[PDB]
């Protein structure tokens, strides 16, 4: 996955150059000195690509050429099990309802409704995480 | 024709406005030339490259022209570079501020109207000197520990006040009187929210901000002169609330002698309406009229 | 003090002329007249943060105050100088009276609150809903002076309680019940908002029945 | 109570009191005053319509002279089910019942305009005596409270 | 819906004991009569005070108040009744005011709670206000203690 | 109904006559319209009742026409 | 549905299914008849998850 | 936008107030940039992107479904400010400060818009 990491490094270099140039260009020319709200975002924008880019670099150097990373790869090269993909689940709609309940409580500033929403979110998230791991009932 | 290529821009009443309009016409000409070429290319291939009803074989499968791609990348870079230079040249002239202005205007914006004050008048020829600074009422807002650098959000010391002030009313459009052919300094200070000081004939506007110094905003702009007399309307351009659309104002331009006379009645306690009538001018705004209080025709 | 009147008009010119006019006559269909309202009305409306308003609706709701205590006094004096009206009570030092307005007989205040105040609000003063869009706000954040001025002035839809209909002693006793009932902790546990059966049933269904059903599925079996 | 004791836009519950009832210091007087407080049909709302809004007042037939100028007296008992309807809004002149949200237009003789109420609140005629105290100008012309099969 | 053209905060009138009136171009605010009372009627011959504030809507010219008449007696105006261009004309001194006054000599009995017609003319209007009787910051008058019954 | 429409057709009550739902729909709109006879002075609620009644009537008519023409069964 | 996606050598994407009863000639099972009882839909409920291990 | 466009046809407020018009473009912009334009970017992406790269599904099928419901309930909350008596947000989709402040925007419509 050499190309995947190269995309983020290209963005990392431009974001780093823009953050450094704009900081040094506002410290001596913008009224009031460095533009802080504005610079902080640019500096940490580089970090977003830096974290993803660095991780992709480390991952690429560990694994060899994948079937999708091979210029001339055959379809039969990728035969086998891919992994686990959830066939169906009604938990995600419950999580959204739980999160929306807390948001309405936060919007109207209802401490009881916020607490219920937080408890609903934890309960709904627990169901999503444990959906494919609950064992058979022991009776 | 400059009247059609301006796309509705006013002619302008200040040298900065005239320069800004010149840049607008040239940029529009450049934009139309580029647009015509692209539209012509799109129309040419849409009328002459249509599937002929006798062409069996599929067309040549070409998708890479390296000499062409480089050529059509440098050319757009050259056009923007040329425009950028003129952009920098014009904006430097428009934002230039003379260290010794002759008329200083305090523009105060609130919800939802305008207040105009004469901070200082000092004509270049020395025929009229005036000092409208009123320090006995600006420091009455001191409020002090304080949540922000020792002061409450209701500090309001950034606001400026003057002895002669034109206060807007829901039933009276505020009128700002300025001399013709004289440099005018505008100081913009809001009270609660952001407003917009826009005069379409000025071909320039700046947002009125509360606490501009704390926000690192240059709330002061100047015009070299006003080249003609008359009445010009001004509107609030930044959204500020319920009556954002019903807080317009008018700028009145008179001769320097008429402007000097008008200040005399204002100093003599006369209101804005009667002072304007004393210099043979309409007492109320003529470009704009106060909006009806009736929330609508169904009220 | 001429400085106080001039300062108040200076705030009025930049904050209130849009809906009340320059001479306090009121802009039709935008705002009523402030002549005769008095200092008490301005003090309450500004300290509670209600004014300046921002749009026309069923009720302008409460919000953080736009002016500090010094500016409220100047604003109230300017309006008081035009038409007179009721004035906010003050202590010996000349500040706004807060502690001295607490009555010593809460039992009388409770009955008075139930007769005259607990109709729009509830018993514990949590609030209530009015005809269409309008609603009575919570009384747990109002200081005694704000309650006194609200009784004196009669905000948007609130029958004005004059000093003759409700004497200052009765008003002092009424705010004593309001201030006491706000900070008395609930004796049977969590207050559940102090609204009555409506939160009790909701809490029941979401706690007792959820626990009872959840326990049942633990003890019981599926299929 | 005197007419000047209430400002414009105000509301205050009044009760039927007589000289023979007494001040309640004695045992007999207190018992007499108990039924006044415990009277189901006793409470009456006394509202003072603003003089600027007096031109919008619509009088009911047989009750045109039931007001003492800008002072109006309406029963506090809701005509629907008997709850005290004392949520009087001074500007909208709307009397709201907190039990089942019935709204009455105080300007239009307390005519119901919302909720399950279908009959207007009874109006009590009022006047002043020689001493300037507000007194009743007779009895209600219609029964007070919830309707029944034998009403009207 | 409640924020439409018909609002409940824009149609709201003043929460005072006065009357808002429009005499063509001059706005009358807080129009009320001050009259202490002891008996059910204020007997004729008792001097009362009529208080209001006149606001000039127009900001160009001035106006002057003349010939205030009513069917309650004779109204006497003392002082400079000229209202400035964009100012106020406060007549009388209401309670809570730390000099134009209107003096009324009653010819017929009046009482609190009723409406009495008044005529206001400045130069271009004849309007009726129906001025009521309003009590200011005066305390509640004592009531005699009832007997045992 | 049969198995392909309701798989558990023989395991319980799975069929409701279309006449009941069509008549109930007309009565649903009739009840919405008659409620305009009240003490309310406003007409915003009246238009909401009219719109809902019209929507219900349109749905009932659409279903009846489709059932009559044989497009749906 | 086990939720496991397997790519066939010719590129077909199929999901591994766990039959609830007997199977016909090839992989596909013979359809069972509904008996009014709940039918498992999660492979973890059938014991495919195993046990974490005896201990504290 | 049609209500706004039909109001800006003739000078004067025929059927809309200033507050209603202010709520109109705020909600119009919010709905038509964030509730229509942004989701349909992932609307087409959930359609063909797994097909384009020859994939059988998305990386996180459960998380993909969570995004739809979270978005749908989030969009409904902001629109739900209209049913409030004060109205929905009336300060514009750029929600400039301090207009969006409690002092200048005290209604619950703006609060529901934020959440
Ligand atoms: C089958 C059912 C289907 C429906 C059809 C069948 C029924 C339709 C047929 C009729 C029917 O409904 O009957 C059943 C009912 O019967 C009895 O009701 C009758 C009548 O109807 C009532 O309206 C009436 O109000 C009752 O008088 C009482 O008020 C009178 C006054 O009021 C008049 O004024 C009112 C308001 O104004 C005035 O207000 C105040 C009054 O002083 C003052 O402030 C003031 O004066 C004011 O006036 C002003 O006026 C002018 C202004 O302009 C000016 O002058 C001035 O300014 C002044 O100020 C209005 O609001 C009223 O409407 C009315 O007009 C007083 O005069 C009385 O003294 C008393 O207090 C009266 O009672 P009575 O005479 O006592 O008895 C008679 C007898 C009933 O006869 C029957 O036919 C019975 C047979 C038929 C019914 C079924 C039973 C038989 C079937 C078998 C048993 C089954 C096996 O009794 C009984 O046997 C009843 C027994 C119990 C029932 C058993 C059922 C079975 C049990 C098991 C189920 C009561 O018992 C009710 O409870 C009962 O429901
Ligand atoms: C916030 C958003 C956090 C979720 C972002 C997930 C990115 C990773 C992608 C992924 O793998 O998806 C996993 C999986 C996607 O489903 P799938 O399609 O079946 O993927 C199959 C995987 O291959 C199957 O993999 P798996 O079954 O082994 O599970 C993998 C999972 C392992 O999951 C876990 O074991 C723990 C995760 C529980 C979530 C934490 C609870 C959040 C409640 C906060 C309460 C405090 C307030 O690892 C993670 O997803 C990394 C999460 C690390 C925890 C970060 C918590 C941030 C909360 C910050 C508070 C503010 O989703 C999850 O398991 C957890 C997602 C949580 C969704 C709830 C989002 C709303 C929360 C509202 C919070 C506001 C409170 C008021
Ligand atoms: C097996 C199951 C069986 C057991 C289950 C039972 C558990 C019960 C849980 C709670 C138990 C608490 C016991 C102690 C009670 C106590 O001693 O309490 C003190 C005081 O505290 C509150 O005073 C607040 C301030 O202190 C005052 O200063 C302030 O004035 C006051 O304000 C009111 O008064 C003002 C005027 O004065 C008004 O202006 C204002 O408006 C208002 O009215 C305030 O009160 P208020 O806002 O009510 O709540 C504020 C609450 C914030 O909410 C809440 O806790 C909400 C959460 C619980 C409430 C009940 C559930 C309701 C359900 C939802 C409604 C669901 C709805 C969703 C809809 C979905 C579907 C619909 C379609 O903060 C807190 O307490 C913080 C504490 C947090 C505790 C968290 C619990 C810990 C659980 C951990 C478990 C671990 C176990 C693991 C084992 C292995 C008031 O109560 C006072 O009366 C009371 O006196
Ligand atoms: C395609 C689907 C749907 C299409 C709909 C989309 C477009 C609809 C357009 C509607 C117009 C909206 C205008 C908005 C702005 C507005 O509102 O400004 C009007 C003013 O009006 C009121 O003043 C009136 C006067 O102007 C004042 O002069 C006067 O004083 C005042 O009088 C009161 O006050 C006085 C004191 O002053 C009292 O004395 C007096 O007694 C009284 O009380 C007046 O009030 P009043 O008569 O109440 O009328 C209020 C409004 C009323 O608004 C409204 O549209 C309310 C909302 C109605 C919308 C319908 C709901 C839709 C149904 C569901 C969604 C179904 C779901 C679908 C199912 C699933 C899908 C499967 C198919 O009238 C109108 O706008 C005109 C009505 C025309 C609307 C037509 C729509 C009907 C539905 C048709 C459906 C057909 C479907 C068939 C399909 C085959 C006051 O409010 C003012 O402030 C306010 O300013
Ligand atoms: C199942 C049923 C009702 C069948 C009846 C069929 C029939 C013969 C109908 C004809 C008769 C008619 C016309 C009936 C109309 C209905 C009616 C008016 C009924 C009157 C009394 C009656 C029979 C009531 C039945 C109520 C009932 C069966 C409720 C079921 C609710 C269940 C199963 C809940 C458990 C699930 C659960 C743990 C959910 C979480 C908790 C929550 C949020 C529950 C919802 C909830 C509820 C249910 C409240 O009651 C409530 C009250 C006050 C405040 C809040 C809540 C609240 O949030
Ligand atoms: C018949 C009738 C009265 C209905 C009309 C009113 C109506 C439309 C109801 C809903 C009101 C709402 C939710 C308005 C706010 C705007 C909004 C976000 C609504 C729609 C949004 C939407 C369509 C989707 C967003 C996502 C979604 C669907 C979830 C919403 C989550 C929420 C918060 C729903 C609950 C709404 C609701 C009506 C429940 C109230 C629960 C009750 C009765 C509790 C009463 C109660 C009170 C009052 C306390 O004070 C209290 C204090 C301390 C502890 C407990 C309580 C307590 O339980
Ligand atoms: C319905 C007619 C009410 C009656 C009866 C009482 N109050 Fe009220 N109250 C009502 C409204 C509509 C409002 C808000 C008006 C507005 O313009 O916002 C209020 C407000 C108050 C407050 C202010 C609380 C705060 O802002 O934090 C207080 C302190 C208050 N009201 C007190 C009060 C008392 C003491 C009452 C009995 C004499 C009483 N209210 C009755 C509506 C109504
Ligand atoms: C338009 C947005 C307004 C601004 C600007 C100011 N006020 Fe106001 N006010 C407005 C309305 C629509 C009303 C009546 C109903 C209501 O919302 O309160 C008022 C009323 C008052 C009152 C009470 C009047 C009474 O009779 O009790 C007072 C004391 C008041 N207004 C004062 C006030 C002040 C001090 C302002 C500047 C901060 C101000 N108003 C601005 C609408 C508007
Ligand atoms: C679909 C929503 C349309 C809303 C139109 C009315 C806007 C103002 C509402 C408030 O008041
Ligand atoms: S009891 Fe008064 S409304 Fe039903
Ligand atoms: Ca229009
Ligand atoms: Cu503005
Ligand atoms: Cu604006």
Rounded CA gap, B203 and B14, in Å? 9
Cα four-point dihedral sign C182, C104, C162, D1:
positive
The separation between the first and the last C-alpha atoms of chain H, rounded to the nearest angstrom, is 23
Q: Which two tokens stand for residue D15?
A: 């009760």
E strand intervals along A4-139 = 80-84
Q: Measure D133 CA to nearest chain C CA, in Å.
A: 14
Q: Which residues of C touch A137 (CB under 8 A)?
A: 221-222
Q: Which of C192, C204, C160 is nearest to C41 (CA)?
A: C160
Is residue D42 within 8 A of residue D32, CB to CB? The reply is no
Could you write out the DSSP letters of every residue in A22-34?
HHHHHHTTSTTSS
| Residues 6 or more apart in contact with residue C59 via CB below 8 angstroms | C130, C133, C134, C135, C156, C157, E8, E9, H85
Q: Which of D126, D4, D46 is nearest to C162 (CA)?
A: D4
Alpha helices in chain C (DSSP H): 2-15, 17-20, 38-47, 69-80, 106-112, 144-153, 168-183, 197-203, 209-219
Rounded CA gap, B265 and B30, in Å? 51
DSSP β-bridge partners for residue E70: E73, E118
Rounded CA gap, B242 and H87, in Å? 12
DSSP β-bridge partners for residue C203: none
Q: Measure C145 CA to nearest chain E CA, in Å.
A: 17
Number of DSSP helices (H) and strands (E) in chain F, helices first: 2, 0
Distances from the Cα of F39 to the Cαs of D115, F36, H59, in angstroms?
8, 9, 59
- Matching residue, tokens 């007492």: B283
Is residue B133 within 8 A of residue B141, CB to CB? The reply is no
Q: Which residues of F touch D112 (CB under 8 A)?
A: 39
SS (H, E, C) C117-173: HCCCCCCCCCCEECCCCCEECCCCCCCHHHHHHHHHHCCCCCCCCCCCCCCHHHHHH
Segment holding E84, helix H or strand E = none
Give the dihedral of Cα atoms B103, B109, B112, B114; nearest 10 deg.
-10
Give the dihedral of Cα atoms D136, D140, D146, D151; nearest 10 deg.
160
Where does residue C8 fall: left (phi above 0), alpha (psi -120 to 50 degrees), or beta otherwise?
A: alpha
Q: Measure D113 CA to nearest chain F CA, in Å.
A: 5
Rounded CA gap, H98 and F45, in Å? 36
Rounded CA gap, E49 and E70, in Å? 13
Indicate the number of domains in chain F.
1
Q: Which two tokens stand for residue F27?
A: 């009565």
Is residue D86 within 8 A of residue D11, CB to CB? The reply is yes
Q: What's the helix, strand, coil split of chain B in %, to 5?
A: 35, 25, 45
Preferred mutation among H56, H57, H59, H62 to probe G, highest tally of G CBs within 10 A: H56
Q: Would you mind telling me the total number of residues written for chain D in this entry?
A: 152
Is residue E12 within 8 A of residue D91, CB to CB? The reply is yes
Please tell me the distance between residue D51's alpha carbon and the centre of ligand 8 in angstroms.
21
3-state secondary structure of E134: coil
Who among B171, B274, B298 is closest to E85 (CB)? B274
3-state secondary structure of B33: helix
Flag whether D102 is marked binding: yes
Q: Which of B197, B245, B205, B157 is nearest to B16 (CA)?
A: B205
- Does the CB atom of residue C52 touch ligand 8 within 6 A? yes
Rounded CA gap, E57 and E60, in Å? 9
Q: Are strands D71-75 and D87-89 parallel, antiparallel or unpaired?
A: unpaired
Do A and G touch (≥3 CB pairs < 8 Å)? yes
Smallest CA separation from ligand 3 atom 59, residue: A112
Segment holding B198, helix H or strand E = strand B195-199
Q: Which two tokens stand for residue A137?
A: 């009932």
Q: The domain containing residue F6 runs over which residues? A: 1-73
| Residues 6 or more apart in contact with residue B21 via CB below 8 angstroms | B2, B6, B9, B10, B11, B12, B203
| Residues 6 or more apart in contact with residue A61 via CB below 8 angstroms | none
Is residue E113 within 8 A of residue D69, CB to CB? The reply is yes
**Binding annotation of C for heme c:** 16, 19-20, 45, 50-51, 117, 120-121, 156, 158
Indicate the number of domains in chain A.
1
- Matching residue, tokens 């500096």: A43
Q: Which two tokens stand for residue G41?
A: 């839909």
Segment holding E40, helix H or strand E = none
Rounded CA gap, B198 and B206, in Å? 7
Who among C193, C221, C222 is closest to A112 (CB)? C193
Segment holding A121, helix H or strand E = helix A111-130
Experimental method: cryo-EM
Is residue D67 within 8 A of residue D46, CB to CB? The reply is no
Is cis: bond before B112, omega within 30 of 0? yes
Distances from the Cα of C184 to the Cαs of C117, C174, C191, E29, in angstroms?
19, 16, 10, 44
Please, which chains are in contact with B (at least 3 CB pairs closer than 8 A)? A, C, E, H
Distances from the Cα of C129 to the Cαs of A108, C132, C138, D97, in angstroms?
16, 8, 11, 11
Contact yes or no for E3 and H16 at CB 8 A: no
Contact yes or no for A136 and G4 at CB 8 A: no
- Does the CB atom of residue D117 touch ligand 10 within 6 A? yes
Burial class (CB in 10 A: 0-12, 13-18, 19+), B55: exposed
Angle at C29 between CA B283 and CA B232, to 5 degrees: 30
In the sheet that holds B175-179, the strands lie side by side as B175-179, B249-254, B230-234
Distances from the Cα of B80 to the Cαs of B30, B75, B86, B231, in angstroms?
10, 9, 10, 38
3-state secondary structure of A85: coil
Q: The domain containing residue A59 runs over which residues? A: 1-139
Q: Side-chain half-sphere of C197: how many Cα atoms within 13 Å?
A: 0
Rounded CA gap, B298 and B170, in Å? 20
Angle at C31 between CA C30 and CA C35, to 5 degrees: 155
Q: Which two tokens stand for residue G35?
A: 């008996």
Contact yes or no for E5 and B295 at CB 8 A: yes
- Matching residue, tokens 């504030």: E53
Segment holding A109, helix H or strand E = none
G13 touches chain F (CB under 8 A): no
Rounded CA gap, D2 and E140, in Å? 9
Where does residue C114 fall: left (phi above 0), alpha (psi -120 to 50 degrees), or beta otherwise?
A: alpha
Q: Which atom of ligand 6 is nearest to the CA of C192?
A: 53
- Does the CB atom of residue C43 touch ligand 7 within 6 A? no
Resolution in angstroms, to 1 decimal, for this deposition? 2.7
Rounded CA gap, A34 and A28, in Å? 8
Q: Side-chain half-sphere of C160: how many Cα atoms within 13 Å?
A: 25
Is residue C143 within 8 A of residue C98, CB to CB? The reply is yes
Q: Measure F11 CA to nearest chain G CA, in Å.
A: 8
| Residues 6 or more apart in contact with residue C60 via CB below 8 angstroms | C50, C51, C53, C54, C156, E9, H106
| Residues 6 or more apart in contact with residue C201 via CB below 8 angstroms | none
Rounded CA gap, B288 and C2, in Å? 37
Is cis: bond before C39, omega within 30 of 0? no
Is residue D41 within 8 A of residue D78, CB to CB? The reply is no
Q: Which residues of G touch A80 (CB under 8 A)?
A: 6-7
Rounded CA gap, H100 and H115, in Å? 13
Q: Which of B238, B116, B258, B244 is nearest to B174 (CA)?
A: B116
Please tell me the distance between residue B265's alpha carbon and the centre of ligand 5 in angstroms.
79
Q: Which two tokens stand for residue A123?
A: 């309960």
Q: Which of B131, B132, B96 is nearest to B116 (CA)?
A: B132
Q: Which two tokens stand for residue C59?
A: 């009720």
**Binding annotation of C:** 16, 19-20, 45, 50-51, 117, 120-121, 156, 158
Rounded CA gap, H112 and F20, in Å? 42
Is residue B101 within 8 A of residue B183, CB to CB? The reply is yes
Rounded CA gap, B285 and B166, in Å? 13
């Amino acid at each position: 996955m050499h190309i995947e990491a190269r995309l983020f490094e290209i963005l990392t270099a431009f974001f780093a150059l823009a953050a450094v140039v704009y900081a040094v260009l506002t410290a001596m020319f913008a009224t009031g000195g460095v533009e802080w709200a504005g610079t902080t975002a640019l500096v940490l924008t580089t970090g977003l690509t830096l974290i993803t880019g660095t991780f992709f670099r480390f991952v690429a150097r560990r694994l060899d050429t994948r079937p999708e990373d091979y210029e001339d790869a055959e379809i039969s090269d990728g035969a086998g099990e891919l992994g686990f993909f959830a066939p169906h689940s009604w938990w995600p709609i419950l999580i959204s309802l739980s999160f929306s309940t807390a948001a309405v409580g936060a919007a109207l500033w209802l401490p009881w409704l916020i607490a219920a929403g937080v408890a609903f979110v934890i309960t709904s998230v627990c169901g999503l995480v444990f959906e494919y791991y609950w064992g058979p009932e022991k009776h | 024709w400059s009247d059609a290529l301006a796309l509705g821009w006013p002619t302008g009443i200040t040298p900065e406005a005239k320069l800004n309009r010149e840049l607008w016409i040239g940029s529009v000409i450049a934009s139309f030339a580029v647009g015509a070429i692209v539209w012509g290319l799109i129309f040419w291939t849409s009328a002459f490259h249509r599937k002929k009803a006798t062409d069996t074989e599929l067309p040549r499968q070409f998708g890479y022209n390296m000499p062409l791609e480089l050529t059509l990348t440098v050319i757009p870079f050259l056009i923007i570079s040329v425009l950028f230079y003129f952009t920098v040249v014009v904006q430097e002239r428009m934002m230039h501020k003379d260290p010794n202005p002759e008329v200083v205007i305090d523009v105060t914006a609130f919800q939802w109207n305008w207040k105009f004050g004469y901070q200082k008048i000092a004509f270049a020829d020395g025929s009229f000197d005036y000092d409208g600074a009123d320090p006995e009422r600006k420091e009455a807002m001191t409020s002090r520990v304080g949540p922000i650098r020792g002061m409450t959000p209701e500090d309001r010391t950034y606001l400026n006040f003057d002895k002669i002030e034109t206060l807007g009313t829901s039933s009276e459009i505020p009128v700002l009187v300025l001399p013709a052919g004289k440099r005018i300094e505008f100081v913009l200070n809001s009270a609660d929210v952001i407003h917009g000081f826009w005069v379409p004939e000025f071909l320039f506007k700046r947002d009125v901000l509360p606490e501009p110094k704390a926000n690192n905003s240059d709330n002061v702009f100047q015009v070299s002169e006003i080249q003609q007399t008359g009445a010009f309307v001004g509107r609030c351009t930044e959204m500020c609330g319920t009556f954002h659309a019903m807080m317009n104002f008018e700028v009145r331009v008179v001769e320097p002698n008429d402007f000097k006379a008008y200040i005399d009645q204002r100093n003599a306690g006369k209101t804005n309406a009667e002072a304007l009538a004393a210099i043979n001018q309409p007492p109320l705004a003529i470009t704009t009229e106060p909006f009806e209080s009736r929330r609508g025709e169904l009220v | 003090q001429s400085a106080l009147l001039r300062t108040g008009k200076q705030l009025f010119e930049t904050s209130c002329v849009s809906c009340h006019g320059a001479n306090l006559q009121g802009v039709p269909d935008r705002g009523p007249s402030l002549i005769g309202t008095g200092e008490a009305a301005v003090y309450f409306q500004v300290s509670t943060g209600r004014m300046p308003a921002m749009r026309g609706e069923a009720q302008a709701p409460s919000k953080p105050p736009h002016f500090d205590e010094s500016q409220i006094d100047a604003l109230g004096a300017y309006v008081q100088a035009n038409g007179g009206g009721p004035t906010v009570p003050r202590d010996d030092h000349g500040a706004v009276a807060q502690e001295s307005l607490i009555g010593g007989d809460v039992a009388r205040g409770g009955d008075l609150f139930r007769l005259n105040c607990a109709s729009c609000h509830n018993f514990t003063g949590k609030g209530g809903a009015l005809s269409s869009g309008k609603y009575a706000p919570d009384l747990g954040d109002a200081n005694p002076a704000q309650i006194y001025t609200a009784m004196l002035t009669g905000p948007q839809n609130m029958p004005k309680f004059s000093d003759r209909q409700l004497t200052p002693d009765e008003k002092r006793d009424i705010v004593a019940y309001v201030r006491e009932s706000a900070e008395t902790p609930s004796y049977g546990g969590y207050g559940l908002g102090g609204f009555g059966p409506a939160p009790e049933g909701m809490a029941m269904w979401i706690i007792g029945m959820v626990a009872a059903i959840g326990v049942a599925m633990w003890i019981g079996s599926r299929a | 109570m005197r007419p000047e004791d209430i400002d414009a836009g105000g509301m205050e519950t009044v009760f039927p009191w007589r000289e023979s009832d007494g001040d309640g210091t004695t045992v007999e007087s207190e018992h007499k005053l108990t039924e006044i407080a415990m009277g189901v049909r006793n409470p009456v709302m006394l509202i003072r319509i603003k003089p600027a809004d007096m031109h919008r007042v619509i009088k009911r037939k047989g009750q045109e002279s039931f007001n003492f100028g800008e002072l109006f007296a309406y029963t506090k008992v809701c005509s629907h089910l008997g709850c005290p309807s004392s949520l009087y809004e001074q500007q909208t002149y709307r009397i709201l019942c907190p039990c089942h949200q019935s709204q009455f237009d105080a300007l239009e003789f307390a005519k119901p305009i919302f909720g399950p109420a279908a009959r207007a609140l009874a109006q009590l005629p009022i006047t002043i005596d020689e001493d300037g105290y507000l007194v009743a100008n007779g009895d209600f012309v219609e029964p007070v409270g919830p309707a029944f099969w034998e009403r009207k | 819906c409640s924020a439409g053209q018909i609002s409940q905060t824009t149609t709201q009138e003043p929460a005072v004991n006065g009357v808002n009136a429009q005499a063509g171009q001059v706005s009358l605010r807080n129009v009320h009569l001050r009259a202490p009372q002891q008996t059910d009627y204020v007997e004729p011959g008792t001097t009362v005070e009529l208080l209001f504030v006149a606001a000039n809507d127009s900001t160009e010219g001035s106006n002057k108040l003349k010939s205030i008449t009513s069917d309650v007696g004779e109204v006497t105006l003392t002082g400079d009744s000229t209202v400035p261009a964009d100012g106020v004309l406060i007549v009388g001194e209401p309670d809570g005011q730390i000099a134009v006054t209107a003096e009324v000599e009653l010819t017929k009995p009046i009482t609190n709670g009723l409406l009495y017609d008044f005529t206001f003319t400045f130069e271009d209007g004849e309007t009726t206000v129906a001025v009521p009787i309003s009590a200011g910051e005066q305390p509640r008058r004592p009531v005699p203690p009832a007997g045992p019954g | 109904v049969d198995v392909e429409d309701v798989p558990s057709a023989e395991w319980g009550w799975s069929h409701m006559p279309i006449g009941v739902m069509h008549i109930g729909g007309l009565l649903s709109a009739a009840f919405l319209l008659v409620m305009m006879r009240g003490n309310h002075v406003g007409h915003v609620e009246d238009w909401f009742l009219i719109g809902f009644a019209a929507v219900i009537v349109a749905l009932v008519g659409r279903n009846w026409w489709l059932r009559r023409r044989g497009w749906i069964r | 549905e086990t939720g496991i996606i397997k790519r066939l050598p010719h590129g077909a994407y199929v999901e591994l299914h766990q039959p609830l009863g007997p199977v016909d000639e090839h992989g596909h099972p013979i359809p069972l008849e509904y008996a009014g009882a709940p039918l498992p839909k999660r492979m973890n409920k059938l014991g495919s998850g195993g046990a974490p291990g005896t201990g504290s | 936008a049609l209500f706004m466009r039909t109001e800006l046809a003739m000078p004067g407020l025929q059927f809309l107030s200033n507050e209603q018009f202010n709520q109109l473009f705020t909600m119009h912009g919010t709905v038509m940039l964030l509730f229509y334009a942004t989701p349909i970017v992932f609307g087409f992406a959930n359609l063909v992107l797994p097909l384009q790269i020859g994939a059988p599904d998305v990386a996180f099928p459960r998380l993909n479904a969570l995004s739809f419901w979270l978005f749908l309930f989030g969009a409904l909350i902001a629109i739900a400010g209209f049913i409030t008596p004060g109205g929905a947000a009336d300060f514009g989709w750029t929600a400039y400060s301090p207009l969006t402040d409690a002092i200048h925007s005290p209604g619950a419509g703006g609060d529901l818009w934020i959440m």
